[PDB]
Amino acid sequence: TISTPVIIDSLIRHAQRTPEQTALLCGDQHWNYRQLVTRAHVMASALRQAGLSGQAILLNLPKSLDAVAAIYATWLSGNHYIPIDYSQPSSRIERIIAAAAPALIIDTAWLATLDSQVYHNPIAAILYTSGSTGTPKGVQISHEMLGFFIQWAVRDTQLTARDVLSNHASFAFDLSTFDLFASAYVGAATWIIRESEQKDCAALAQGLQRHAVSVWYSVPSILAMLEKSTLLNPTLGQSLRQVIFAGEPYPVTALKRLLPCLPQPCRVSNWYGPTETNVCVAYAIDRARLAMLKQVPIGLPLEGLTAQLEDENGDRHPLTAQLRLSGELLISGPCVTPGYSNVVVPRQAALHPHQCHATGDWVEMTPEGLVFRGRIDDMVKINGYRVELGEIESVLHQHPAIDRAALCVELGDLRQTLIMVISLQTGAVPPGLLELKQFLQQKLPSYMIPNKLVITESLPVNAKVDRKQLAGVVAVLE
């Protein structure tokens, strides 16, 4: 019903042709291609024996060699994987499991139990993101989507078997699709960065050097941390030939501090897109042009995709080199999710089945390509993490003291500030800022915990909160 996924065919060929080539590094451990593929086959056999076919398999695992083997094992058994960020609170992983309704959860215990003993499915994975109602929102990722992205990304970066790729992001996020799958496509090695290492600038710098990392893909926020650490320099990083940032803008002031930390000949790229498209717009930085740029362009749509800008009138303008207009970016082509797995989002419902996604990003077409201007809804990027303000609101409305709650945001250069505006129940003890942070700490990951509180007698509402009015009530009350 589908072609064999190109990533699985490539992985099997590398285990056959170069069995002893390193596939994966994690802590002090490494696997060659034979060990990875053999382990994936052992796990696939167990899923086959459990009679799982065409099902969601949720990977409740830390970043590890075994978690990568489980990804491939789902595909080899006709199943799709549900990755999660193992660093977040257990109560949110429970909400994802409830939303995903997986046929099977692979956890540490399942691996322990295991060790003591015709492709019909078009879907490769479902990535559950922040949902505006609080309910996690599943983005279906097809084999077709991953193949399209990986073949484009290998060509763009000239990736080969000699490369050593970092894997910074959690498997829950689509950056990991390049780090793992582009590596497997070409027969390269990937360094799986563990949860304890993801923020640790000394451990990252030491690993870049130890493993001779040649290709790095992350959000700007960790690259700007590595710059500020003073630990990243062109000698420690001499193996780096490609750095890729994505997920949020890299302010040009900060990006000019990073470049002297990297080898001069290192290619630096800006990659753009939401989970629903993976990377769909890309720009390779010209260090000569960079001094004159006020913003780094996100660039041009990938070969094989098309774009439109939807103006303030709702009219869709086809993207051309000559267009000089700001509007909402709409992307079309094989990158686009077939749709959300578990919720209806009416804005996308007559777009996704026509291979179109409305990004929610306001963008400008310029002589240097597309430039990101801002979001137009209530989804915000916090250090490159996807946050629906409605998710945080849904949790705050459960606090015993709260009547109504709404968030607003202040944006700066590599900084965002979430502000909670709440009204209280009659007779309720007003919670303090630290009390509400402690309330949220059990429920949401740290980057969704707001850092300002404003208590008002009443939240502005319509015949739903009027968000236009929040900055003003914050101003008056401050």
Next chain:
Amino acid sequence: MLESKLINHIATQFLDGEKDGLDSQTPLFELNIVDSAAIFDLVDFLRQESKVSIGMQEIHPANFATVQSMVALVQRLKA
């Protein structure tokens, strides 16, 4: 004196002056009082006020999780 300087710095720089509920055991990063990306701003304050060298090549970042841990680290560096 260092513990008090650090409590006042976090109250002033990160919490608009309010010490309400802030103490030496408050987990600064877990409660998003200090952005994970702003750790080097704390390191800089600590190095300046403590008058000990703090090389991030050799010093675990967990040492910045609380005021108590920052104070414990400076005690170890002052041999």
